[PDB]
Swiss-Prot record, chains A, B, C, D:
This is Galactarate dehydratase (D-threo-forming). SUPFAM superfamilies: Enolase C-terminal domain-like, Enolase N-terminal domain-like. Belongs to the mandelate racemase/muconate lactonizing enzyme family. It comes from Oceanobacillus iheyensis (strain DSM 14371 / CIP 107618 / JCM 11309 / KCTC 3954 / HTE831). It comes from the Bacteria. Disulfide bonds: none annotated. Substrate binds at R15, Y89, T296, R385.
Length: 387, 387, 387, 387
């Protein structure tokens, strides 16, 4: 059993918010004809440059060609050796490793005729509560529109959301006020995400005024600059609400643990390099008796299926998670998208081999994009995921 | 696919040193007729009391009955809930969880017709260098005999050993002197193990005089009392040689990491609760960029096969490990013991499904013991594994 | 005065060691016809992926178009906003910002008819002592060859070198022994560079044995993993020799200062984002009363000219620096390379406007490369700069 | 291009408050006839002794004679070597270095026929919000008068002020109450300045009662004794409002950074030694991701012009600054004072070469003073700037 070829299909898929993300669907071929599919999710984050996929294919084939897909530890080591962890939230090399590693999980699972679930430790639950995102307001005039989103998604079953805040505290507070005002306890906003936009003492003042509205608030996320472990700690000591932060590298996670800087570790395959790396981060968190939430970069059904399996295998997830990609994207690349019911992400059928997903070549062709080049976008738009 | 029954076979197997250990071979039965075998290795450690196996079977069946053997995360959680981690090196509950978890790995692997290796991440190497133990000298008159052991095992292929020290520094030094004297660089003693017998400043003085003899010394092990994280740290700062310590609980490992108390994490399934728990500890160590060595309690071929698979899957093992059970025990319970060649433990045939081991009912019956009751043994003998 | 267009010329230039690096020569055009030239130096470092220059041109033009080249603070802010600092040594976005910022310095200087020197604070000296690099030995058989290099460069005027160590301590020591042996005090090796390959306690042991040879040793560089501020500190407390480390981001530099983790801050434009960013790092170091050495990634004459001006403006450089690119590369892209005499890098003629360098279109065309795609190279080769 | 002579013109200029300050206007002459003008601002601060200007001219000429005005790094080094930093807020040597360095910027800019702005990094903005000062009340009877000042300056365009507090908390509170009472939200008091008069726990109690009045409060300044880094830290942890402190020396700034003692670094050329030193402090603050406010000692138009250019070049100024000298002084020494409109300090015309200011010899002669000798003044008056 050995890898013989690799395919990288770039796609451009807009969201209902109008923001257009580019992803790369991965295909790993073997000698026995079995193919694994994966996803390098959302390359549309800073820095403002793009990876050459023709070159990337050679590099990855160079690493993978002839390897036994079951040597995940070995292969992941070589992937990390060629794509070092950078201590940065959106390292494109992490998205790359993720697409390879999750495609390998698909490949291995299909080969054994089992669900990726049974290759990750099984099930602890069959679905995980998630939340729909309301992107940050920079102006008060954006509030009304986001209120329609709440009203609309709530009707479709999502009773839990999360709010990106920090750029205009007045608009943030206005939105929260309007929500409480109109839906009362019908809607919950499980977290206010600062996206590392504020220094901790500034986050502290903002947290203090935003938490006047507690609609089932579960955590405050990224309330300090990237890698400001000490800032996170001081803030963790000053706020009653749990402090969550994303895990984008092992070194960074080690440091937050040593400093006891946070309460909840937001782990998501795409930012840490894949399912193999996510399990490592998750287990490190378990060993440290730390809570975990399944974060997201908002991925397509292939990626969401992968994280769904992993998510339903974790025993230390006691809060609402964030993957709602398929609901946010107007398009997708599979025959049947992962399912969301009542604000819950369902783990794919445990009977279906592999990821429990199937590619739709017509959709691939439809959303096909020549490369990962950027479009006219502003820094603010990239940070807020707006258009 | 569901568990229907459980069997616990107690065996008494003496070592060439004369010390007699009791183990429990595990059998987990399923509805589809597939059975997984495991090992609760070496119950012959303090405290001086024994577990009732009739009662234990009911308790474990109570947890396992009807469960899907693939729900390792779920099952391990319940096992931990019923057998809490105690922060003690020889918690018998850990040996118990270990036998269940490794039998589950055997069961799952057999079911998918693959080697436990392919269920643990694959292979990074095919064998791991190990060392033969020379138990501690309490009197100078024990030296000559242990020299015969070195001479004899060296001839059989083991060129690396490890020495338990601390009770009689004169005898320790005498042995080391005699070895260097007779074998020169032909034999290596990769570590001096204090077994937590000394307070750190005492270990420091002992380390200082013992390290006059460096026959390829790789680490100093357990040079501080159990759980003395600060003592380990101070000592780690005063010694050039790496400091290794056993991982017997997640809380304990978390603390050694936060304090950066050691250089090498000695991880072994039996002391942490099984393959699932060992992978967690191993990954926590990887996330912390810490070195790892595969420790041991000296197990039979069933247990050694399990650790062998795990060992050959780890990427952060850069020193000599310790599992040499089958070489130390006069007896075993399998048709073909795991193989040792040139001081290397070979991972079982990757083609053979499961653990790659086969029980020999005649041997089970031969070494069969009514229970895990103790024999006339002294505290010193239990700490040193002597007779 | 405003920017109207941008040009990115990729070149492939091999070294005498055989390693082939790819660089990008930058041209920023203005409405008044004045053009500034810059250099995005050495993209041939991990991670193993490449940036699309067609896309990059649009992104950068998007930021620069219409801007007044004199608004360095403003422009650098926007550059950082689009290419966030990642806490990683070889962030390609940093190389990119560097090429833009140094071309802007060239543009502004030419506009005022002055040397970039007079735009950076003037001169403190006219030349800076540098050292020629001897790349790391992985095998003893590589020693003889590197000895020829020493003998040969020494004859050409370089009496100071630096050695990359860490992978084969025996070969390192062998080389050092042979040098001392053959040249006595004629040659100096100002530093042993570990390239973050070892954990600090391991570096400590290595440092201890390598420093048996002190041929004018000035510093130990990168003796701890990337961003291991605490490891650097502990080591700084255990070694008499100064500890130097590269500055690859402001956050990272801030942390090393707060922890007093090192003795010498190795600052180089290419890794921190340009001359503007390097001055900031340099001034931060001055405010902290910390020593500074001008590091390097080994750049062409355009980049070397830029760093030369900056280097001769600093008052806190009291050790030998590292930029010897033009001596290491078989080719270059200018009419007259920067000059090295007696192991000193000379700052370009202070009378010549701009960088004091001139592009040679024929050379640009000669070493022209279609893109920044990778060639068959190994991880080891990328870390050691060998072929 | 070389310096040939120096002139120091002492002037005495009273404020509308009646306090009389002495300044020294600087003139640096060159061989090519180009002259740079500068300002050693406000010598009227403790300690109670004065510098001999005849002697000072010899000393400075001794340092400057024959030097190339463009060697700012070199010259500033020599200036610091002759006028060491003392860790004291009002070190007269700092005022001296400032006048020389800013005159050198004027000289260099004129020489290149550009604005000092284009010699400091360009523009990030064209004006900076500033505040008018209300000096501290020692008695309740001083309140009414200061209320007239608010009412009057507000009418002239200044809607933001700052209040010096600490000696009579009752009068402080009375003033604040009266302001809120009469102007509501029309006037803002961006900061309460303690002038290091109180120990931190005392400042904490005072802060607690004064902040009952929040008229757009932006920061609490100098709430701890001079150089009490630990006191600033403890207080920074107990107050929600940002803590700002002046930067009077590199060593002091380094220490506040290492201890993370404050939120806002108040940087002003006069207290740190000039534009060159201010940029260093500013960049150190940028590298540390710390906020900055342009402080002041209240300077004439020459000095205010200099700081204006620097201020409009900084990217990390996100609060209201303090330079309002020309509005506070009844007299000045230029043909056209820097302009203030709507509480904003405007950067001098970017088209005018140099500082964008012109000396008025008649005014120099008018406010001419024989020396910097003191007049009958009390300690309280010197601390509060009252008469
Ligand atoms: Mg995303
Ligand atoms: Mg044992
Ligand atoms: Mg380089
Ligand atoms: Mg003053």
């Amino acid at each position: 059993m050995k890898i013989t070829d690799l395919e990288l299909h770039a796609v451009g898929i807009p969201r209902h918010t109008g923001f257009v993300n580019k992803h790369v669907i991965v295909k790993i071929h073997t000698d026995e004809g079995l193919t694994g599919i994966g996803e390098m999710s959302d390359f549309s984050h800073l820095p403002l440059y793009s990876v050459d996929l023709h070159d990337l294919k050679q590099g990855l084939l160079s690493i993978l060609l002839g390897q036994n897909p079951f040597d995940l530890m070995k292969i992941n080591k070589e992937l990390t050796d060629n794509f070092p962890e950078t201590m940065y939230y959106y390292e494109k090399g992490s998205f790359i490793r993720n697409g390879i590693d999750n495609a390998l999980h698909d490949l291995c699972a299909k080969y054994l005729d089992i669900s990726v679930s049974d290759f990750l430790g099984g099930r602890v639950k069959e679905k995980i509560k998630v939340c729909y995102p309301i992107f940050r307001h920079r102006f008060s005039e954006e509030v009304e529109s986001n209120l329609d989103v709440v009203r609309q998604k709530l009707e479709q079953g999502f009773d839990v959301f999360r709010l990106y805040v920090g750029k205009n505290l007045d608009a943030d507070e206005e939105f929260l006020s309007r929500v409480k005002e109109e839906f009362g306890s019908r809607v919950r906003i499980k977290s206010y995400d600062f996206s590392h936009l504020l220094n901790w003492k500034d986050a502290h003042r903002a947290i203090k005024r935003l938490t006047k509205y507690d609609l089932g608030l579960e955590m405050i996320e990224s309330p300090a600059p990237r890698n400001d472990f000490d800032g996170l700690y001081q803030l963790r000591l000053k706020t009653d609400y749990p402090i969550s932060e994303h895990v984008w590298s092992f070194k960074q996670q080690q440091e937050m643990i040593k400093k006891d800087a946070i309460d909840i570790f937001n782990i998501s395959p795409v930012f840490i390099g894949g399912l193999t790396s996510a399990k490592k981060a998750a287990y490190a968190a378990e060993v440290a008796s730390k809570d975990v939430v399944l974060g997201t970069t908002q991925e397509l059904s292939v990626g969401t299926a992968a994280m769904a399996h992993l998510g339903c295998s974790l025993t230390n997830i006691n809060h609402t998670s964030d993957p709602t990609g398929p609901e946010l994207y107007v398009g997708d690349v599979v025959k049947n998208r992962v399912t969301y019911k009542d604000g819950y992400l369902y783990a794919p059928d445990r009977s279906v081999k592999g990821l429990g997903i199937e590619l739709d070549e017509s959709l691939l062709a439809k959303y096909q994009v020549p490369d990962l080049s950027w479009d006219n976008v502003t820094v603010h738009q990239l940070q807020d995921r707006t258009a």
